[model samples]
Target chain A: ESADLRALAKHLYDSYIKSFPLTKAKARAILTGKTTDKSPFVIYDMNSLMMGEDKIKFKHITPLQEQSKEVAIRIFQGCQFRSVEAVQEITEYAKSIPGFVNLDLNDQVTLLKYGVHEIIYTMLASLMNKDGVLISEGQGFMTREFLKSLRKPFGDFMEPKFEFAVKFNALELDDSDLAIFIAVIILSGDRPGLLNVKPIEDIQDNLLQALELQLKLNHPESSQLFAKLLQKMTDLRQIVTEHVQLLQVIKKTETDMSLHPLLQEIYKDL
Target chain B: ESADLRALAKHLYDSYIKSFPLTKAKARAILGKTTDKSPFVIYDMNSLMMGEDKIKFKHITSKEVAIRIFQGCQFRSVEAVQEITEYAKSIPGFVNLDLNDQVTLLKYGVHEIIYTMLASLMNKDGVLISEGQGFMTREFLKSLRKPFGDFMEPKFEFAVKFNALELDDSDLAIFIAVIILSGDRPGLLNVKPIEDIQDNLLQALELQLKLNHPESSQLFAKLLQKMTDLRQIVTEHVQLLQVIKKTETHPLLQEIYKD
Candidate 1:
């Protein structure tokens, strides 16, 4: 059991460092900082990368109004930027895992495409409070109220996700648990096209077993936390599925605005 | 295009016939008989049959009832998955894909297709719990208990709208085929081949819809839109299941719903 625990700690530690080169104490310090901090570690600024000519002030608007298209597009564009940055972080994190980098490039892309949104949602739980998520590196907190106020489709699209966040936050997972969880999501063998499914399955199974072990040790009073955590992945899948549909609607309605190529590829034919 | 469409339609229809003999029309006709006289029989999971001499509805615990209901639903679900898998295998070039891809397609898409069929099996009143048995009215289902009843809420909401479209068996066959061979499911190794098959099926479906239901021009788009709607409904269903798992769980439900 000691050796098993040590291996889990090592895997978790290796993945944690690769994803964010900060120790547990240091990462927790940064995460717990005041929401208004204009700190590099708090948020990766994606606004600067937006097309200046099409810079639109996206507000909580009805999805049906003429203004709704602009708002949805701008917000979706921001989401894409954030998604890209998250994917970059996840890729580095995955590279640290043994045998992940050795997989064929096509398989790598396939895994990332399928896995990234789930990871992003998983990470989003870290920033979630009772009201809503801490957005833009904590500069802005998107309240559940405002999210519910957005135009019909846009608001409807996000309500379920926020509900998930609130429920997920109740689990009260720590940073280490999240790292292992994200790794399990990424390395899952169930992704459709893998050159080698067995190894990935082995890796994921190890991570899951390790996480379950840690959960038992960490949350002694809450024995069900591990099962609940696994269920969150299904919630994440639902959110991403709806997100794809939202993107498809945007792509059809807003032809003038250009989608980031990576987002475009992700949304293509979905 | 017409000949190509005819060929595609023929293939979908043939596979559908091989999979299920019951059509919507036939089902509706069967339903038209006196409610008690319907041929369908709903299995009473709460009851036990002993020695072929006596059957009795034993008073069981809530957990026991939940387990029985979930196990019954799962049995049909797995059977449906296997049926869809056979249909996929029958499709040209589908079996040629890597075995892993085939498995992935089935795993990811089976729930969506199964829910689609369940939607059809349901009426405005409630779902038919078993073939030729009794219709489980919405009120009765809601009365069954929490989680068991809670999970059926979103499904009934979605199924009613889906049934409104009133797609016949041939139309459903193509639609189900499209759901099964979806090229866009994550983890696909080579989407091009799957997409190729889906494309042929879509063309056949659209053409068939046009010719078969000339008056309902919008049904094709409506049916396409329903796929997205199905995704949302299934999402809510899973969320409910997650909630139920936290409180009470059946071993069989856990096994069938393995993440």
Candidate 2:
């Protein structure tokens, strides 16, 4: 029982982790605010794109002096673009899964809607080796202060996520377990409006069973870690809800600043 | 054909609306806070005054009212789901789906449709719990104990935003149908065709919404956005259930939330 579970976890690790590298530093740096570099992929930067304090403010009415709002929007835009890149990669990864492409295109979109953010945050949690996510893919870490300095709503939007990451990182889950976990979240059948739910559920169940069994073997001392990880999924949902609402608020409030089309589509209703 | 669909939708809404009447005025008085004369109360009424100074509602606690409200709401929810199931069956092509597919649609689609029903029952202040028994204000629900309080908050938040879209009965009827036929549910046997049905419904709905509210050109997109909002709200409810399942042991709650 144990050996099979361990081997299954290993297989998932090589399949997902080895296939999707943590950060393609060169491709990612193109999006950095500090750089004038070119790459095949689009770039997003908070510092470079934001309206300067002076540009936003005048002597009598320094409304633009509320740069935190701009800062918040810029950070959110950067994150949004990064999220799209991540989603694109996950789509490629999704195709590698057996029978995934056979699902209807609409079904695929639905799964991607719920699955992408969860996966992005999950990977982000793992990547938070320092104070915050490596925002420009190793160009720099988005320090906790940078997040806190943003307006309250934006700060609120980010802090809980970081808090979740810090705790999740504390779990010390290896690349193998992380890979399986991502697969499990992506293949989750619980997503509403899914067709062919059983197959997806079956995939998720097998991954979970293997994950559970492997956790028991890998961390004999702390049997509670597995449960904690499951709880983290729920926590992830809550944080993602907060993140979406913040995006909606920014979209509503910041009429002057344009949002990327993808994000605009995401927050279209609000 | 369009007229036939409209009549069918109207019947569904009327059936759903008629079954759940507003709370009574007397009941509302009981639930009202003593500190103010407003018919609505925010949380636990036990500490509130009824009419004159020195009168307190010591008879019932917030927990009891919460239990009462949720129980009532849950029973009505079950009824609503049944009604929606029957309504779905009557749609021309709906019955053609595989039995398993039909069940999957209802199972996953129930909460999404149900919340829209719940949204209709709400005003800006709060939901009409019993009808005349006055409405429960958002603040009052937020004041409820623990998970009980927590559950109402998200629903209230979603309701406020959803209501902002101002969808009328016809709009809601078509929207509900679209939610029921949604193909995105996990474990579906036939997704493309289910989505095809949804796409057709969306077209009909957009036409009707545009015709009905000509001034509001953005209503269709607004309504669609609420679908995403509804999904997020339901997601939060599931999380709340996860917490309640671990801590509490109400058989009815357990049965209702059974995964």
Candidate 3:
């Protein structure tokens, strides 16, 4: 137990990848050659967590734009199941809407990004229609207006500080998917630091608790060994802080599109 | 849903192994060796788990014994601890005397067989002593009667099993640390081929329940994946069964040990 406490600590931090969809997805992708990169930065070369660039921002924008366009074109083409009623429902509820022909790319990306699989299914009918009308009528349109309206919120839709800001509410909305977004931004740089645990510790804790409970019951002997491992978790907390500071330097390096200011805008206004 | 779920499944399994004592211990030890040669049976090199021959059980046993002894002696020797009055108070009242003697054997593994641990812990101590003394006193010279009493119990205790078909119930009473013991038992030789899902579903359900628990939750995704790889496991199980059946040819070996 004493010999292994540090490894036990390392595992608790590492288990966060399992609970997080994005992190888990990235880890698997990288390891399996689906992506030629590592997912989350491990801070130290502690476990060969790569010191390579993170590609979160561009990664988010590119794949998302491609998927959104594919879904958009599908809606604009036509529904496959052509029952008169099916066509009517597709036309009336999804295809017939007005703003979709010129829907803001920002809003479309937001709605689809949150629960990508579910969102794709939710819009299947809309995606099949020729008019792409549902994109205009759906929350995608409202999301853009929500961003625009936040600046001078006709009635408190956004805070007072947002009135003087650049009014990039879409950027604020996009920040909801922050990890991948930041990862892409940091990827373009020479070397970037890893993510901080403080932002995601709650989620990490849920996963660790699950692990502890699992070990407690199935591995009663193992539970004591792992419990002793928990004492070493704070070591990673220090590693996380160092990486966060390193990443902060990269976050400040943006020339034209400063992510820190953008983040500050979201922090202050949103 | 169309995403690479298998990869995520493996990540969760990796995370679990990163922390799992048995797995972590093996990871470092398994370098440059075949997957089947790890310390424990792991789902390595795809679906194959380590077999008894591959694990080099003799090597693990030696290392494990050394480590256990090193740790046991680190704080206090069993012999020294038993002699100390401090531990005597800590031990329960009913079993104190026999346990006190067992501690002495544990120091050098003299009477440390599985059977002895169970008996002394069960009846609280002096039952074996009184029985052993009574039998020895009957056989030895009458002039040396008092000196012969101590030897009585050993003769009776040892012969009781030889004379009877059924085993003594005290044999079942093993010790506290025995609760944590683990090693793959090369099981029964004549297991019938499992016929259908219905026949083995209960065992499958039991494994699922075990994997679903928190400590095992990280293993949950991997376990699901491994179920798809069940073909490999059946192959290994069948191999072990074949080996066991062959072992039955040697009646001398079978009679010497029943594993």
Candidate 4:
């Protein structure tokens, strides 16, 4: 009796854990804002993120030795490419969910479209903290203050992610907990454009029960963890919505910066 | 090997084939919508809410007429009871379930099982076969009037949609067991193990369709969706069942109502 569920949880965990670029220890190290690898440490400033209203230009600060617009956009684009890989990885992971393939093809795409963003932010715990998020494989630190300093078109787009990741890291979930949590996101039956709702909900229910059982074992002293985790999911939903809304602003208003087609495909409706 | 699951599926149809509704040749082609009414009144359900004597029925009846009206649906459901019990026992991991969990699964599951079984008897239109012996009309059904007339309509629509799946007796066998062994049924005690059993049945059904119904690519998933739809169908079925139990029912219906 216990045999199948044990395998069920373990199989889903392995499916997700196998896809990531970073190891558990590596992700934790990056979150601390220190370079665990030999990559040289550097600072990126939000002051450098400044640009003209329409001309979209960059300038250098003589004293601070920081460059504006060009370097910031380069790093920002670099981060976008990295998250694209994460989205694909989560997409591949979603396929392993027991009945995911059984869903109509459009439903598979729609669930992943809305859902992958949440888990991407969830996974950011490995690369984030209150100080800043690691970038260029821990080669650079992009400070939250720097993120907070973004120009109008890009304003308020990233601060919520940093806030969410810093608190999320406090929970210190390992790969197993995260694997199932990702299932919760993709199998969310409420997402718009699903062709078949009922089976998706059934899969969602199974994943939630599995998550609750896991939290029971892992956080025996923490009665509120499951509910807290669900509330975090709600928070992630809000965060993903803001992420999309701001991306649309960037796509339309900031012609100088290019958005990836992959991202456009995923967030196109909004 | 495909050995045990095939045998399990085979056994279900064997039992089902022998059960009262003999399908093709059995229905007597009975006439009129009046002959088709199920005993429970959704108006009586409203009757409980407005106080008992406020009872105004569309097919108003004395106790004898109520017994006869109820008998067709109730008697078929009564035969279904023993057959579903037998079917459930043979489901992998079912006999080992906590006894209370077993009852709860049956209590919630039978309504869905019976409803899905109805799909086989339904046409693309809302036409229905009652008790394996009568062709019940949709007009007479709609004639029962608001809330009272509303009872069987939902199940009929659901059955028509399900009938479109065109699952054979073999495909339906696993679905019945799947319905009975559902882990999500409320009031279960040992939920985790029940989920495990449901998982096995689900896989078996998946395999059954993949092997037996290969041309129908999405059949298994559509069936899973139908089970969820069947839940809404069953929910209203049980709601009226509970409602009519209060207004009074046949002597034999107590067996179904006792739960």
TM-scores of the models, in the given order?
0.49, 0.46, 0.17, 0.47
Candidate 1, which segments miss by more than 4 Å at Cα?
A: A1-270, B34-36, B39-64, B250-259
Q: Which sections of candidate 4 miss by over 4 Å?
A: A30-40, A44-69, B1-259
- Which is better, 1 or 3, measured by DockQ? 1
- Per-candidate DockQ values are 0.02, 0.02, 0.01, 0.02
Q: Mind giving the per-residue lDDT tens digits that candidate 3 earns over B92-163?
A: 221223443333323322122222221221121122111111111122212122322332233234333222
- lDDT for each of the candidates? 0.65, 0.63, 0.26, 0.65
RMSD of each: 22.0, 20.5, 28.8, 14.5
**lDDT tens per residue, model 2, B119-167:** 6666556665433334566677777667777776777767766766667
Q: What share of the true interface contacts does each candidate keep?
A: 0.00, 0.00, 0.00, 0.00
State the lDDT of candidate 1 residue by residue for A1-270, as single tens digits.
546755775776667766753333342343466443333222112332232223323332214334435554555556567667677888788787666777778777877878877887777766665555554544444555655555555556566667777768777777777777777788866575567876776666567667767787778976445644664565676688778877677666656866678766755322
Q: Pick by TM-score: which candidate is best?
A: 1
Report the lDDT tens digits of candidate 4 across residue range B1-259.
5776566667766655665354422221222134554322222334222322333322223343333344445656666787778777777678899989999998777777877776665553334333432344555554563444666678777866686776777777777876777655558888878867665666667678878888875456456645546655765677777776676544554555464
Ranking by TM-score: 1, 4, 2, 3
DockQ of 3: 0.01
Chain B TM per candidate, please? 0.84, 0.74, 0.18, 0.72
Number of colliding residue pairs in model 1? 10
Error of 4 at B58 (Å): 37
Task: For residues A1-270, write the lDDT of model 3, one tens digit per residue.
Answer: 322433433443343233222332332344344545433322122111111113211122222242233322222122112122222332232211122113335432232222222211222222111211112112111111222232121223212213211221111211112222222111111111213323222333333434444444444543132222222222222233343343355444422222323223212110
